[PDB]
Structure 1
C-alpha cells in the first residue's frame, strides 16, 4: 500500500502520459480558440513548474481578481470543444495497446483508475521491495523497533532506494532505536549525500523524484538538512545547564560554513534556527553566571568580563532575528522572543 522506492516500471505509464497530455493540449487549444513527449513538456511550459514546497499555496488574500466566468458550460458547449480533439486522439490511440485504448477512453470520460500501477508490476526485485516498504511502515505504526530497522537495513541493500523513505524512516527508526545511532549521523551523512548545491528545477519530466523531500542545493531547501540542524540544537539542549563539549559551537561553525549560497542564500529557519542556537548559547552563559547574582554573593571576580561577552551576543542575536524578519521570514513571533530576551536581560542585571 505505501510509497515505493523505485523508478516506475517505465513502459505503459510513459505512453498513457503521451495520450493524456496530447488530449489536454488538443482540448485546451480549442478552449483557447473559443475564448479568443514534447506535448508533455509543453503542458508544463503552459503551467510552469512546482516551487520548492508542495502545493502552490500562497495566501488567499490580496488580489480579488473577479471570476464569475458565467459558469459558461452548456453541455452543448463542452461537446463543441470535445468533438474534434477525441478524433485526433484516435490516430495515436490505434498505435497504442488495447489496455491503453480503454485507459484513455476511461480518463477521457472522467473515470479514474482504481488500478494502482504499483499493484501489477511483477518484477522479482520490485516484487519484494513493495513487501518490505509496507512491512516497515506497518512496523513503525506499532513502534516495533527491533524488527522495523531489520526491514529498513535490508530495504537499502536492495538496489531500489532513492533517499526517499530512507531519510524519512531512517531518522525516526534511529530515534525509536534506543540503541545505536543518532539520526544526526545519518542526518549529517544525508546532508553530504544531497547538498545539490546546484539550482536545478523545472525543465524535464521529474517523474522519478518529485518530492520536495529529496533535492535542493540550488534554492529549494532540503528538509533533511533543516531537520539535521533542528535535531542538532535539540541534541545540544539535553543535559546542558540542567573541552569535550564543543557541539553548540560545532553547530555555530557548521552553519557558518554556509552563510548563504542556497541556505543562507534563501532565508528563514536557516537564519532563525541559527539565532535560536545562538539564543540558547546566551542563556547557558547567564546560568553559568546567573543564580543569585552570577553564582552567588556578587562577582568582585574582575568586574564582569562575562556580562560583556553575553551583551555582545544578545546584541548579535537581535541582528540575526531582525535580518530573518526583514528578508520576508514569516516563521518568527517576534513579540515573544523580544519579551523573553529582555526578561532574561533582567537576570543578567
Structure 2
C-alpha cells in the first residue's frame, strides 16, 4: 500500500487536525503551569522544522541533561490535568460531527486510527492515480521495465499529480536504454525548474510538500541536484567532458554545503590521474595545479560533517601520482 503523489480532501481532516491540535495545546498548557489553526501554529512555533532531513539527529558526546527527577507522575494528578481541558473541549465539541466526536474520544483514550485517508476518498480522478502509483512500484520491483516506462509516461500527464516521483524515472531510464535519453537529461530538467532560491523560513503549516527529498535552496541543496553531479561524475568516468562538469560546479559558489566541494575535488582528482596514463615539458606543470586544487578543497571540506574517507587515503593516493611525476 504505497504512497500517492497528490494532496487530498480538505473537508473533515482539516477540521480533524484542528480538534487534535487544540487539545494538545490545552493539556500542554495546564501541564506547564503546574510543572513550575492558531492551536496548530502554537504547536509548530515551539520546536522546529527539520528541513534537510526527516528527523533531527544530534550529538550524544555533549552536555549531560539527566532527568532522574522524581518519576513525577501520579494517576491522581494526571487525571486533573486531563479533566478541565476536556471540559474546555466539550464546549466546541458540538460543532464537529459524530464521526469526528467519536474520533477524539479514541485519541483521548490513547488509541490510534486504523483506516488511512487514501482508502476512503472515492473520486474518479483520484482512484485512477492510486491504482497507477501502486502498479508503478509493483512492476519496478519486479524489473518489468518496458511496462513500467509505460506506467510513468501516463502518470505524469494526469492533471493532478506533482513530480514526487523523481527517482522512479530517475532509475527507469538507467535500465531501459531503448529509445529515451538517459537519466542525466531528466535530472537536468529538474535543476533548471526546481531551484527555488528563496530562503523561506518556516512559519507555515506545510502539507503539499512534506519531504527533504524534493526541496532546496533555502539553506540546503536540492536532493536531485547533487545526484546530477554524482551521475555526471560517473558518466565521464566511463571514457577511461570532465571540463564540462568542473565548470558547472564552479558557477555556483555554494558556500554552505561541503558535499559539493567533495565533488569539486573529485573531478580534478580524476583529471589528474587520467592525464598520467596518457602521459606514460608542459604536460607536467598541469598535473601539479590539480593536486594543489584538491589539497585546497579538502581543507575547505572541513567546515561541516566528515567527508573524509580517512583523511589519509585522499592523500595516500595523491603522493602515489607524485611518485610517477
**TM-score band, normalised by shorter chain:** over 0.9
Are 1:5 and 1:162, in contact at CA under 8 Å, matched by a contact in 2?
yes
In 1: Cα distance, 2:250 partner to 2:206 partner: 26
In 1: Cα distance, 2:271 partner to 2:250 partner: 22
**Selected match of 1:267 from 257, 264, 268:** 257
In 2: Cα distance, 1:183 partner to 1:121 partner: 34
Question: Structure 1's 178 and 333: CA in aligned 2 closer, same or farther, altered over 3 A?
Answer: farther
Higher deviation after alignment, 190-199 or 90-99: 90-99
Are 2:220 and 2:257, in contact at CA under 8 Å, matched by a contact in 1?
no
Q: Which SS does the other structure have where 1:171 is aligned?
A: helix
Q: How far does residue 181 in structure 1 lie from its aligned partner after superposition? A: 2.2
Question: Structure 1's 21 and 60: CA in aligned 2 closer, same or farther, altered over 3 A?
Answer: same
Deviations 1:140-197 (A, max 9, x none): 1111101111111111101232221234444345445554221110001001121111
Are 1:275 and 1:320, in contact at CA under 8 Å, matched by a contact in 2?
yes
Are 1:136 and 1:152, in contact at CA under 8 Å, matched by a contact in 2?
yes
In 2: Cα distance, 1:125 partner to 1:161 partner: 10
Q: How far does residue 94 in structure 1 lie from its aligned partner after superposition? A: 1.3
Q: How far does residue 259 in structure 1 lie from its aligned partner after superposition? A: 6.6
Are 1:5 and 1:165, in contact at CA under 8 Å, matched by a contact in 2?
yes
Gaps of 5+ in 1: 241-250, 291-303
Q: How far does residue 2 in structure 1 lie from its aligned partner after superposition? A: 0.9
Higher deviation after alignment, 224-233 or 199-208: 199-208
In 2: Cα distance, 1:108 partner to 1:289 partner: 75
Could you tell me the TM-score, scaled by structure 2's length? 0.93
Are 2:232 and 2:245, in contact at CA under 8 Å, matched by a contact in 1?
no
Question: Structure 1's 169 and 271: CA in aligned 2 closer, same or farther, altered over 3 A?
Answer: same
Are 1:268 and 1:331, in contact at CA under 8 Å, matched by a contact in 2?
no
Higher deviation after alignment, 264-273 or 170-179: 170-179
Q: How many residues align?
A: 325
Are 2:233 and 2:245, in contact at CA under 8 Å, matched by a contact in 1?
no
Q: How far does residue 265 in structure 1 lie from its aligned partner after superposition? A: 2.6
Are 1:167 and 1:190, in contact at CA under 8 Å, matched by a contact in 2?
no
Are 1:258 and 1:264, in contact at CA under 8 Å, matched by a contact in 2?
no
Higher deviation after alignment, 258-267 or 210-219: 258-267
Question: Structure 1's 268 and 255: CA in aligned 2 closer, same or farther, altered over 3 A?
Answer: farther
- Residue in structure 2 matched with residue 342 of structure 1 by the alignment: 319
Question: Structure 1's 173 and 142: CA in aligned 2 closer, same or farther, altered over 3 A?
Answer: farther
Could you tell me the TM-score, scaled by structure 1's length? 0.87
